[PDB]
Amino acid sequence: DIVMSQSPSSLAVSDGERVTLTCKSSQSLLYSTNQKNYLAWYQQKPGQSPKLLIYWASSRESGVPDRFTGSGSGTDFTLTISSVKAEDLAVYYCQQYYSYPLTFGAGTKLELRADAAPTVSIFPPSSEQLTSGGASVVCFLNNFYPKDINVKWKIDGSERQNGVLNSWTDQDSKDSTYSMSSTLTLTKDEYERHNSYTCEATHKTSTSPIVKSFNRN
C-alpha cells in the first residue's frame, strides 16, 4: 500500500507569518496521460467536518481564500499559506487518490506563543474520599507552555508509575496556554503506610526541576 509521512508534527506560529507544510509519498503519484497529481489537502476544524482546500496539489477550490496555495508534483507536496488568521487553528491532512486502498496522513497542527510556567497546584486528599475505601491525590499543571512536559510521581523517595492518570487539554483562547492534570489513585491502607508524597515535573524553560511535596501527618 502507498504510505505517506508528514513533517513536522507540530510548530508554533504567530499571526501573519508564512506556514509551509510537507507531505511525502513513498511512490510517484503522477499520472502520465494528463500530468495530474492525485493528492488533495484536507482541513478539519475542532467540532466540524473536514473540508478540502487544494485539489490536484497546485490549484485552488472555489470558496477557499487566496492565502491557501499549493505546489509540488510527483513526490514532494507543499502547502504554503501566505498570511494566517485567527480562524486558521485547524488540523491539516493530505490524502492520495492514486491507488486502492486509500491512506491518510499523520496530521499537522499549528500552535501559538509563548512563555507560560506553573509553580504549585498540590491538593491533598479530602475526608470524603477515604470513606469510599480509596484514596486519590491529584496534580494539575495550569498555565504552562509548551505541551512537551514530563510528570513524575514520587512516594517517600521511591518512584511509582502504576495508577498515574494523565490528561492534557487544548490551547486556550484567552492567553494561548495549556493545562494538564495528573491523578494518582490508590487504595486506603497504602495511603496510611506512607507520609510524604512528592509531585515532580521537569520543564524546558527552567534549568532546575520544580520540587514540591506535602506531608500526611
Binding site: 491538593f123 470524603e128 490528561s167
Partner: protein
C-alpha cells in the same frame, strides 16, 4: 448545497451490531459513489471502504475484513453501514464521504459510537481543598473530582455561572469502564475561606444534580 444527515450517538453493548445511516438530499443517488472514513485517536483518519449504488461495486480495506459490509437504499436515497463483532478498539467517530468529483468531497456530521460493558451510574463528587495553612501566592486554587459516571458528558459549572472566568475543564479518561474528570478554577485570597464556593455538576442521562460546598 448538499446535506449529509447521519444518525445520532448510540449506546451499544459489546457483541451486538450497530447500523449507521447517511441520508442524502439535493442530488441524485445513482450517479456518485459514497465512501466511509473512520476517525480514531482524535486526529488519525482510517479509510473504511466504498460502494457504487448503481452497479453494486463493493471494496473494503484490509483492516475491515469481515467487519463492515456496505448497503445502499435505492428507494429512500440513503446509505447504510453495519458493523459485526464489535470490540473495544471500535470506539471511533465515523463519517460518510460523498465522492462528487476529483476536485471536492463532501462530508457529514459524524456518528459518535462508543462501546462499553457498562451501566449508568450517578456521579460521586468530592471537594478538594489545600491542606496548607499559608501560601506565597495571592491566588488560591480549588477544585472537585468527578468519579464514577456513565455516559458522556457532564456539564461542570462554578457558582451557577457567575464564576465563569478562569475555568479549566480536563478531558475524561476511561478507567474500569467508567470515565473520570476534574476541574480547576482560580480564586483570589480575599474571599476564601470567608466566602464559600460550590461545585455544580449535572448528568442529564441520570437526572441527578448534587451541589458540594467547599
Amino acid at each position: 448545497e448538499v446535506q449529509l444527515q447521519q444518525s445520532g450517538p448510540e449506546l451499544v453493548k459489546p457483541g451486538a451490531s450497530v447500523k449507521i445511516s447517511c441520508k442524502t438530499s439535493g442530488y441524485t443517488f445513482t450517479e456518485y459513489t459514497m465512501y466511509w472514513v473512520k476517525q480514531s485517536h482524535g486526529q488519525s483518519l482510517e479509510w473504511i471502504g466504498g460502494i457504487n449504488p448503481n452497479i453494486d461495486d463493493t471494496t473494503y480495506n484490509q483492516n475491515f475484513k469481515d467487519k463492515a459490509t456496505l448497503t445502499v437504499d435505492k428507494s429512500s436515497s440513503t446509505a447504510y453501514m453495519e458493523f459485526r463483532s464489535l470490540t473495544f478498539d471500535d470506539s471511533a467517530v465515523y463519517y460518510c464521504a460523498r465522492d462528487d468529483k476529483a476536485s471536492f468531497a463532501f462530508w457529514g456530521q459524524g456518528t459518535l459510537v462508543t462501546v462499553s460493558a457498562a451501566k449508568t451510574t450517578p456521579p460521586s463528587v468530592y471537594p478538594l481543598a489545600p491542606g496548607s495553612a499559608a501560601q506565597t501566592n495571592s491566588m488560591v486554587t480549588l477544585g472537585c473530582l468527578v468519579k464514577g459516571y456513565f455516559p458522556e458528558p457532564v456539564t461542570v459549572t462554578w457558582n451557577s455561572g457567575s464564576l465563569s472566568s478562569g475555568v479549566h475543564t480536563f478531558p475524561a479518561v476511561l478507567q474500569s469502564d467508567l470515565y473520570t474528570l476534574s476541574s480547576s478554577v482560580t480564586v483570589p485570597s480575599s474571599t476564601w475561606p470567608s466566602e464559600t464556593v460550590t461545585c455544580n455538576v449535572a448528568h442529564p442521562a441520570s437526572s441527578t444534580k448534587v451541589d458540594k460546598k467547599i
